[PDB]
């Protein structure tokens, strides 16, 4: 074959392990291996049963976001089981650091369909995959002619193993349809020259049967990219971008839902529902003229009861942000009224940056109805970790043009202003990184003693909408 | 009705919350509520998709096994999702400390069918349960006549909510068949007098249709009771016995699988597969004339790579057990040859008890082929935290009579001696609390470089058999 040099050496390496594998399962009655009772096809093809992702366990990775002592595919799988529709496990040993023990660990840990990510050229690899708990296998059309594929697809069918059929182009697509593939793998990375072409998934999805599923891989940087690509890919395969971070659960939430805040938390159970639904950030209001005002006693009970939100201390003050800092406060949100100039805004921010020290993020909240609003936003974007842009302009209506806002500002911004289950799609369409969610998920005035409290049913609905949104 | 006094006050309390509930979901379009797409019936009725348990989240509990700061039904549900076939959530507020936020938190957290455990007398409770993520509801025949049940079962059917139909006796069974119940709830506790009658589930299971599922509750102390009752109950409902302990995951494993050890661990990936499969205990061998000998360097890498086994340091020495203790060693296993008398055995144990201090359990391993073996076992049972009884007597065959062994000894014992996937059922039938699993899950001599290493496929098989075993 005319394989990229790296792939060439990987399949020839794998050829040279086949005697090991044959000896390793010699004692196994291949004929009597139980079938896989987990359909990767269905998990991927239905909205229910997990978000639009196959999440991958791979040992070999620089992972410079964190200090790696030991590979724990059980601990990774435990977090992935909460978000994904499948788990991928590298079984290749010599350059991915994988093994069949990793596959078995994940199969025993997770309820999801388990994919053996391997370079499969020999039936014994299919047999080993089922014995060690795989529910699906990768077959690469770049490596296998039509006969080699048909034979291995037939070994797979014996045991109800789903196949992820990798295809690089329109010719491989035609071959896959020919061979009746149900799950098409598209890599945006060309292995020959390491070029990324995000379009390769859109372009090939037009040629793929309507009763088939498309999984795409590589260059899926963030939720913004997931939303750009989610119209034509059923699922994204990701891993190293989640396991290379300090907290795999928080990383999973940030990719799937984006950097969303549920503000105005006043109860443990509200913080708990927010985190469970997919919120990354929790908002705590210190201002005492608020119906969402929380005492330092309530603040610390909420943080303690739900440690797995990143908490944001929200104040209307221009200084004294050191007083707000408590264990678990990740960021302070400057909610002070807009100042007189850009320079006063740059100064306020530097003064707060100064108060809280480099271990606490500094966010600026801005009303876009304020005539200086957009100008400050564009000016102060590099000085802050997040902008909270309030896009409900009140009685005037929306005077500001959202088409004029730079991509850099949007990438730094959570959209605010009565964000609710019903206006979520149209808020997401604006193309900001996040949503700031508060009064729009509270019970209304008719709710008796529950009026003004976070409504858990509304939290379930708005996070479901966020999980499936894509640009239309 | 002629309700126990406690139940009487609970339904009348719940009646008095109905205006609150009606106001709380007033804004909800009941008609347009999505259906539950998770069948509690199927999860319970199939072997696949989780072990034979509905695991319950309840705030109100002494829980003196541990210090309780905050109720975290998300954290509980995260652990339960790994083991169970359903999750139960108390929604009753005044004596169980429950709320609908708890139900929503669990629904957003877990992939399993979610049961609202409530005293349901009014349609609005059905409607609230679906809006806050329930997949199933409890209806109590003791509380509801045939008409009140039919009406609420019909509200349930609108939204594909499964029903757990509680029945106290043969008359309630007949009523439930009459009303076409698919899931029968039996409590072993009589609420009138607080008597436990474990037989009540066996007795009623004879009268229940063959196409229906039986769930039983109360007095399910341990795996031994699960195995005694598992022939006639499809599932057990448990909770307070898992959340009242220091580690909910370890408690779940101990109930579902029992206190099993995988001994002779030499690799991180072997320890990881053991824990994922359901092992509570991991065995580390310090003796240097062993093919399973591990250096202090390898020992500590394994512990670090799999922190969630309780590790047992295995040595053939009669003293010097302080040298074995390392962070993560939960117990030492005295594997010294049997001594000359009971008194020397009682002395060896007291001497080791002395060396390791009260924070490290002390286990005695005994060969039942040793003529003094059984006598020591029966004598030393109160002096140790675990006995490891080796029941493979070698060339003589099994000379010892296992019918003579006290229940107290068995309750303290893991059975050893080549325990393997193929002899697991017959080892479990002996009725010891646990299995000690080692050479019987290694690759055999034909396995090349893998010969003598733990076989992950064998670990998957033996733990699956352990999870479904019941006395026949």
Swiss-Prot record, chains A, B:
Residues 260-471 are annotated as: N-(5'-phosphoribosyl)anthranilate isomerase. InterPro entries: Aldolase_TIM (IPR013785), Indole-3-glycerol_P_synth (IPR045186), Indole-3-glycerol_P_synth_dom (IPR013798), Indole-3-GlycerolPSynthase_CS (IPR001468), PRAI_dom (IPR001240), RibuloseP-bd_barrel (IPR011060). It catalyses: N-(5-phospho-beta-D-ribosyl)anthranilate = 1-(2-carboxyphenylamino)-1-deoxy-D-ribulose 5-phosphate; 1-(2-carboxyphenylamino)-1-deoxy-D-ribulose 5-phosphate + H(+) = (1S,2R)-1-C-(indol-3-yl)glycerol 3-phosphate + CO2 + H2O. Residues 1-259 are annotated as: Indole-3-glycerol phosphate synthase. The keyword Lyase applies. Its EC number is 4.1.1.48, 5.3.1.24. Pathway: Amino-acid biosynthesis; L-tryptophan biosynthesis; L-tryptophan from chorismate: step 3/5; Amino-acid biosynthesis; L-tryptophan biosynthesis; L-tryptophan from chorismate: step 4/5. GO terms for biological process: L-tryptophan biosynthetic process. GO terms for molecular function: indole-3-glycerol-phosphate synthase activity; phosphoribosylanthranilate isomerase activity. Keywords: Amino-acid biosynthesis, Aromatic amino acid biosynthesis, Decarboxylase, Isomerase, Lyase, Multifunctional enzyme, Tryptophan biosynthesis. Coiled coil: none annotated. It comes from the Bacteria. Monomer. Bifunctional enzyme that catalyzes two sequential steps of tryptophan biosynthetic pathway. The first reaction is catalyzed by the isomerase, coded by the TrpF domain; the second reaction is catalyzed by the synthase, coded by the TrpC domain. In the N-terminal section; belongs to the TrpC family. This is Tryptophan biosynthesis protein TrpCF. It comes from Corynebacterium glutamicum (strain ATCC 13032 / DSM 20300 / JCM 1318 / BCRC 11384 / CCUG 27702 / LMG 3730 / NBRC 12168 / NCIMB 10025 / NRRL B-2784 / 534).
């Amino acid at each position: 074959n005319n394989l990229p040099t790296v792939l060439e050496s990987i399949v020839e390496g794998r050829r040279g392990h086949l005697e090991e594998i044959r000896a390793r399962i010699a004692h196994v009655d291949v004929d009597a291996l139980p079938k896989s009772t987990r359909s990767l096809f269905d998990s991927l093809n239905q909205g229910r049963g997990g978000a639009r992702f196959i999440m991958e366990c791979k040992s070999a990775s620089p992972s410079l976001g964190m200090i790696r002592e030991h590979y724990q595919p059980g601990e990774i799988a435990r977090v992935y089981s909460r978000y994904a529709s499948g788990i991928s496990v590298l079984c290749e040993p010599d350059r991915f650091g994988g093994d069949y023990d990793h596959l078995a660990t994940v199969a025993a840990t997770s309820h999801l369909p388990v994919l053996c990510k391997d370079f499969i050229i020999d039936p014994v690899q299919v047999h080993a995959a089922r014995y060690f708990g795989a529910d699906a296998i990768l077959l690469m059309l770049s490596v296998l002619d039509d006969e080699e594929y048909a034979a291995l697809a037939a070994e797979a069918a014996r045991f109800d193993l789903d196949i992820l059929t990798e295809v690089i182009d329109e010719e491989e697509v035609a071959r896959a349809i020919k061979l009746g593939a149900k799950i098409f793998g598209v890599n945006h990375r060309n292995l020959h020259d390491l070029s990324i072409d995000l379009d390769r998934s859109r372009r090939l999805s037009k040629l793929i049967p309507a009763d088939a599923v498309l999984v795409s891989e590589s260059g899926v940087r963030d939720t913004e990219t997931v939303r750009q690509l989610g119209g034509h890919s059923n699922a994204f395969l990701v891993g190293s971008q989640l396991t290379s971070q300090e907290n795999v659960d928080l990383a999973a939430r940030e990719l799937v839902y984006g950097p969303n805040k549920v503000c105005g938390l006043t109860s443990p159970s509200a913080a708990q529902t927010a985190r469970a639904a997919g919120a990354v950030y929790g908002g705590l209001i210190f201002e005492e003229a608020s119906p969402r005002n929380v005492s330092r006693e309530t603040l610390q009970k909420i943080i303690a009861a739900e440690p797995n939100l990143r908490y944001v201390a929200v104040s209307r003050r221009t200084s004294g942000y050191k007083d707000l800092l408590v264990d678990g406060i990740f960021a302070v949100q400057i909610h002070a009224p807009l100042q007189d100039s850009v320079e006063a805004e740059k100064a306020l921010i530097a003064a707060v940056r100064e108060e809280v020290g480099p271990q606490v993020q500094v966010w600026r909240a801005i009303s876009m109805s304020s005539p200086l609003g957009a100008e400050v936003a564009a000016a102060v974007e590099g000085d802050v970790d997040k902008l909270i842009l309030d896009a409900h302009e009140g009685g005037s209506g929306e005077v500001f043009d959202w088409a004029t806002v730079p991509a850099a500002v949007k990438a730094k911004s959570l959209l605010a202003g009565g964000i609710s289950p019903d206006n979520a799609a149209q808020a997401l369409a604006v193309g900001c990184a996040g949503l700031d969610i508060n009064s729009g998920v509270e019970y209304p005035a008719g709710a008796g003693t529950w009026a003004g409290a976070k409504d858990a049913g509304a939290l379930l609905k708005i996070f479901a909408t966020i999980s499936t949104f894509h640009y239309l």
